[PDB]
């Protein structure tokens, strides 16, 4: 049926190309889009074409692109291919955009996801010229129903001089009602409002994004799917990680340090997350609750079985098969899921009050349990900090999970010193790899190192780590957090130079003797 | 006037020595004490003497010492000298204890100060065997009136099996009424309560700590002073920093990015932050309010000048002379000050809600604006992260302040890579040295570097930093955050090897 139920706004409907003409060189553009869901698709494609055409004529044409979080091939991909983005924030997973960032062709800053809206309102990104937002429908009174994510869309609509809406008929109509949008002051000028959430299933707002219809300069009718990345079926490494984690949860419950329903759960996406979610479906724990950034495949499974009672998030992150499942059954799933603005889903006040358990991936940790989530060798961006800081620091328990090695064993995920730090020791209590689980609660840095080295490090790298540690203990400037600055980053340099962190036996290495 | 106003409790008075005997080897001890204020004094000394005797007899005798934040010679000092603390958290400024920590003789973890209560309730430090809390007075109904700080005392009282109270006649009886202790669930089992603070000057609790009298195993009458370390009268360097920041605030106000009375101010521990407050006391911003972790001399000065209307904190951090001033004028100041539990003063939910401006010192920052607050050369503890993270990450504006050099110019406070990170780039927007102010809002790492190097670095080090950055841009593995890993930490090593970061 008709998706634009406000008659007057129908007059604004126009082709993607025409809408794209509203976007000018130098513009700051805020868009919907979070974990590959709910980003605009047709206008960015048309924009990229016009950008390339300008460039070919020696005409400059780039934008500043501010999003909810990651988008997809139609947005980050097309614009990066066109070399059309001078600044990007706060989170990207597109390969072409990643290359632009790492070549210094696109300036990038990965703000904490829960803080983006506030910094935008503060003016940190400059004046927003355009808000470009995907919609399921437009209501009788001109409300904008978001699609598969909320992200920062309400904030972008508030700030933007002009607004473009893409109404996507691929998106199920019964998404209307799944969102909770607050008109409260979460991210505006102090003093802010108390965000009165005291349960993960609590709604505080309404189903629509609000915007002055007079700012709506174009509406584009679309029909195109999200980026539904393939399902990352757990491998033995992930299954092992999930096993150690579930054993730990079970023990915490038996010691009355967690209720049998655990606490509200936040998890990332990927092989390991999937393994944890399958473990949880099978585990002894009942009445689970999600308070996270994302809804993933394994969550629908638990919502269906009743193992999980509710799932709060800002976005969907589903395989094509899972999206298919939720579409054929949106009526049911809409009652089990709440999609929130990301400044609410990622609100530290709320995360702490609910006592979330945070479970996040990492590039690497050093022996003292400082965590790198972003910058390989310290300089090459992967995705971005995302909401890992929002959750890690605010959680009741902060847990980091990773294979003990990377790149087919040629890199150790436990290193003498992290090449970049995203999460300080104070923000990480539990580490899990396929080798075991380190519980660091109440430990000093030297004590942390003893646990991480013994429980988490791969056997191929443990002697090398222990050697570094032992010699640092003997020689470090101070002994509170012992280091040898002469070799702290030397394993990373070895990888840059040789493609492996494992040392040759053709030179002396202290641990070889 | 009698300090123990509950008659029944007077039967529990005993000597410090006898009290100390309640504390067993291996015990976890939660004490009052924050920025050199309100820590117990006599029991620790008696404990320390007894520990030395025991060690000499070949008897192990150590405890875990958990506090609000820093204490003083009678506590950290005495116990450190006796080699009697096997674990310490969350924050220390005593030289003897610091040496124990840097020698690996006392285990230490500097938690975010606002989180300590919750981690204690979670059991991260173990079962609390003892709470040793200094009080001004015990009310007729058995309330415990705190002294010069609140810190974590209410939590330690809740958790501890046995309670020892030191009632210190040295402390001003007029402290009674200054504290605001909330009986709601801030740091307990989830789901926690909403703390209904929506203005920095709002009281939501009562004047006393609550404890079941049955848990009080001993009360010790004491008479000794808090440890007031003086602040450096602002020199040329501090004054220049304060000047740049005040000008900055002025431009923000002019651009309508701050109100004319600014926002609630958090001013960190240390001389630099203090010097800024001195600038403010005669500044163009009126009707200021503090929502801070501590009230240092400079903030007391702002309340005196009338430039600041009210100040919230968990503790006093006053010089010996400022502490004398407030006691002689406790009536004037008592209505201008609110002392709260540290898990409330340092609550990220409240800090963000109020839109605090965070101003903190630092050891060093790298060219990308990562900040080290704690570990010199990456390994030697100074004080601790304290509340700098609670505030930096939650604040409306996060500002870091430091001389551009340390150790008489032999160390650059701006380095290629911080030897230890306490505050990531995302948690630091503004840097100020005596050389200038770097405004990093909205900038990528390479753009942050340009600002930090050009605005903040000392001229002796700027060319070296630029050289590092330019060659990194050319040769780094990735160009998003360019580094040369062979030399990223080489300045710190140069200092270790030669005593200076300046090459031959
Ligand atoms: C850290 C992070 C990249 C790990 O991803 P993951 O899917 O869990 O684990 P993977 O083992 O598959 O690694 C992902 C990539 O990082 C690489 N990687 C992981 N650890 C590495 C290391 N120590 N050194 C070099 N590369 C590493 C992998 O090779 C892989 O790269 P590829 O795509 O080229 O093959 C990911 O968790 C992330 O981006 N975190 C930041 C955002 C976040 O945590 N948000 C929380 C809410 S969703
Ligand atoms: C970082 C910190 C030590 C700086 O204190 P400060 O008084 O403002 O700065 P100063 O320049 O006077 O230096 C203080 C000490 O640190 C040392 N220092 C500062 N920068 C240094 C550097 N780059 N390298 C080595 N030492 C350094 C100084 O030498 C001095 O030590 P000394 O007396 O033994 O010579 C202090 O702010 C702190 O401990 N911060 C952590 C807690 C905090 O920020 N709490 C926030 C909420 S209250
Ligand atoms: Cl709130
Ligand atoms: Cl801990
Ligand atoms: Cl709250
Ligand atoms: Cl920013």
Coordinates of N, CA, C and O in Angstrom, one line a residue, chain A residues 236-296:
Chain A
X236 N 36.1 -23.9 15.7 CA 36.4 -24.5 17.0 C 37.0 -23.5 17.9 O 36.8 -23.6 19.2
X237 N 37.8 -22.6 17.4 CA 38.3 -21.5 18.3 C 37.2 -20.7 18.9 O 37.3 -20.5 20.1
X238 N 36.2 -20.3 18.2 CA 35.1 -19.6 18.7 C 34.3 -20.4 19.7 O 33.9 -19.9 20.8
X239 N 34.0 -21.7 19.4 CA 33.3 -22.6 20.3 C 34.1 -22.7 21.6 O 33.5 -22.7 22.7
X240 N 35.4 -22.8 21.5 CA 36.3 -22.9 22.7 C 36.1 -21.6 23.6 O 36.0 -21.7 24.8
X241 N 36.2 -20.4 22.9 CA 36.0 -19.2 23.6 C 34.7 -19.1 24.3 O 34.6 -18.8 25.5
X242 N 33.6 -19.5 23.6 CA 32.3 -19.5 24.2 C 32.2 -20.5 25.4 O 31.6 -20.2 26.3
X243 N 32.8 -21.6 25.2 CA 32.8 -22.6 26.3 C 33.4 -22.1 27.6 O 32.8 -22.2 28.7
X244 N 34.6 -21.4 27.5 CA 35.2 -20.8 28.7 C 34.3 -19.7 29.3 O 34.2 -19.6 30.5
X245 N 33.7 -19.0 28.5 CA 32.9 -17.9 28.9 C 31.6 -18.4 29.7 O 31.3 -17.9 30.7
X246 N 30.9 -19.3 29.0 CA 29.8 -19.9 29.7 C 30.1 -20.6 31.0 O 29.3 -20.6 31.9
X247 N 31.2 -21.3 31.0 CA 31.7 -21.9 32.3 C 31.8 -20.9 33.4 O 31.4 -21.1 34.5
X248 N 32.4 -19.7 33.0 CA 32.6 -18.6 33.9 C 31.3 -18.1 34.4 O 31.1 -17.9 35.7
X249 N 30.4 -17.9 33.5 CA 29.0 -17.4 33.9 C 28.4 -18.4 34.9 O 27.8 -18.0 35.9
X250 N 28.5 -19.7 34.6 CA 27.9 -20.7 35.4 C 28.5 -20.6 36.8 O 27.7 -20.8 37.8
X251 N 29.8 -20.4 36.9 CA 30.4 -20.3 38.2 C 30.0 -19.1 38.9 O 29.7 -19.2 40.1
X252 N 29.9 -17.9 38.3 CA 29.5 -16.7 38.9 C 28.1 -16.9 39.5 O 27.8 -16.4 40.6
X253 N 27.2 -17.7 38.8 CA 25.9 -17.9 39.2 C 25.9 -18.8 40.5 O 25.2 -18.5 41.5
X254 N 26.7 -19.9 40.4 CA 26.8 -20.8 41.6 C 27.4 -20.1 42.8 O 27.2 -20.6 43.9
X255 N 28.1 -19.0 42.6 CA 28.7 -18.2 43.8 C 27.8 -17.0 44.1 O 28.2 -16.2 44.9
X256 N 26.6 -17.0 43.5 CA 25.7 -15.9 43.7 C 26.2 -14.5 43.4 O 25.8 -13.5 44.0
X257 N 27.2 -14.4 42.4 CA 27.7 -13.1 42.0 C 27.0 -12.7 40.7 O 27.2 -11.6 40.2
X258 N 26.1 -13.6 40.2 CA 25.2 -13.3 39.1 C 23.9 -14.1 39.4 O 23.9 -15.2 39.9
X259 N 22.7 -13.5 39.1 CA 21.5 -14.2 39.1 C 21.4 -15.2 38.0 O 22.2 -15.1 37.0
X260 N 20.6 -16.2 38.1 CA 20.5 -17.3 37.1 C 20.0 -16.7 35.8 O 20.2 -17.4 34.7
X261 N 19.5 -15.5 35.7 CA 19.1 -14.8 34.5 C 20.2 -13.9 34.0 O 20.0 -13.0 33.2
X262 N 21.4 -14.1 34.6 CA 22.5 -13.2 34.4 C 22.1 -11.7 34.5 O 21.3 -11.4 35.4
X263 N 22.6 -10.8 33.7 CA 22.3 -9.4 33.7 C 22.1 -9.0 32.2 O 22.4 -9.8 31.3
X264 N 21.6 -7.8 31.9 CA 21.4 -7.5 30.5 C 22.7 -7.6 29.7 O 23.8 -7.1 30.2
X265 N 22.6 -8.2 28.6 CA 23.8 -8.6 27.8 C 24.1 -7.7 26.6 O 23.2 -7.4 25.8
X266 N 25.3 -7.3 26.5 CA 25.8 -6.6 25.3 C 26.8 -7.4 24.6 O 27.8 -7.9 25.2
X267 N 26.7 -7.6 23.3 CA 27.7 -8.4 22.6 C 27.9 -7.7 21.2 O 27.1 -7.0 20.7
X268 N 29.1 -8.0 20.6 CA 29.4 -7.5 19.3 C 28.8 -8.4 18.3 O 27.8 -9.1 18.5
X269 N 29.4 -8.4 17.1 CA 29.0 -9.3 16.0 C 30.2 -10.2 15.6 O 31.3 -9.8 15.8
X270 N 29.9 -11.3 15.0 CA 31.0 -12.1 14.5 C 31.0 -13.6 14.9 O 30.1 -14.0 15.7
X271 N 32.0 -14.3 14.5 CA 32.2 -15.7 14.8 C 32.0 -16.0 16.3 O 31.3 -16.9 16.7
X272 N 32.7 -15.2 17.1 CA 32.8 -15.5 18.5 C 31.5 -15.1 19.2 O 31.0 -15.9 20.0
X273 N 30.9 -14.0 18.8 CA 29.6 -13.6 19.3 C 28.6 -14.6 19.0 O 27.8 -15.0 19.9
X274 N 28.6 -15.1 17.8 CA 27.6 -16.2 17.4 C 27.8 -17.4 18.3 O 26.8 -18.0 18.7
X275 N 29.0 -17.8 18.5 CA 29.3 -18.9 19.4 C 28.8 -18.7 20.8 O 28.2 -19.6 21.4
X276 N 29.0 -17.5 21.3 CA 28.5 -17.2 22.7 C 26.9 -17.3 22.7 O 26.3 -17.8 23.6
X277 N 26.3 -16.7 21.7 CA 24.8 -16.7 21.6 C 24.3 -18.1 21.5 O 23.2 -18.4 22.0
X278 N 25.0 -19.0 20.8 CA 24.5 -20.4 20.7 C 24.7 -21.1 22.0 O 23.9 -21.8 22.5
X279 N 25.8 -20.8 22.7 CA 26.1 -21.3 24.0 C 25.0 -20.9 25.0 O 24.5 -21.7 25.8
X280 N 24.6 -19.6 24.9 CA 23.5 -19.1 25.8 C 22.2 -19.8 25.5 O 21.4 -20.0 26.4
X281 N 21.9 -20.1 24.3 CA 20.6 -20.7 23.9 C 20.6 -22.1 24.6 O 19.5 -22.6 25.0
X282 N 21.7 -22.8 24.6 CA 21.8 -24.1 25.1 C 22.1 -24.2 26.6 O 21.7 -25.1 27.3
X283 N 22.6 -23.1 27.2 CA 23.0 -23.0 28.6 C 21.9 -23.2 29.6 O 20.7 -23.3 29.2
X284 N 22.2 -23.2 30.9 CA 21.3 -23.3 32.0 C 20.5 -22.0 32.3 O 19.7 -22.1 33.2
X285 N 20.9 -21.0 31.7 CA 20.4 -19.6 32.1 C 19.1 -19.3 31.4 O 18.9 -19.6 30.2
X286 N 18.2 -18.8 32.2 CA 16.8 -18.5 31.8 C 16.5 -17.0 31.8 O 17.2 -16.3 32.4
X287 N 15.5 -16.6 31.1 CA 15.0 -15.3 31.2 C 16.0 -14.2 30.9 O 16.1 -13.2 31.5
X288 N 16.8 -14.5 29.8 CA 17.9 -13.6 29.4 C 17.3 -12.3 28.8 O 16.2 -12.2 28.3
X289 N 18.1 -11.2 28.9 CA 17.7 -9.9 28.4 C 18.9 -9.3 27.7 O 20.0 -9.4 28.1
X290 N 18.6 -8.7 26.6 CA 19.7 -8.0 25.8 C 19.5 -6.5 25.9 O 18.5 -5.9 25.7
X291 N 20.6 -5.8 26.3 CA 20.7 -4.3 26.2 C 22.0 -4.1 25.5 O 23.1 -4.1 26.1
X292 N 22.0 -3.8 24.2 CA 23.1 -3.9 23.3 C 23.0 -2.8 22.2 O 22.2 -2.0 22.3
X293 N 23.9 -2.9 21.2 CA 23.8 -2.0 20.1 C 23.0 -2.7 19.0 O 22.4 -2.0 18.1
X294 N 23.1 -4.0 19.0 CA 22.6 -4.7 17.8 C 21.8 -5.9 18.1 O 21.9 -6.5 19.2
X295 N 20.9 -6.3 17.2 CA 20.2 -7.6 17.3 C 20.8 -8.5 16.2 O 21.0 -8.1 15.1
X296 N 21.3 -9.6 16.7 CA 22.0 -10.5 15.7 C 21.2 -11.9 15.6 O 20.3 -12.2 16.3

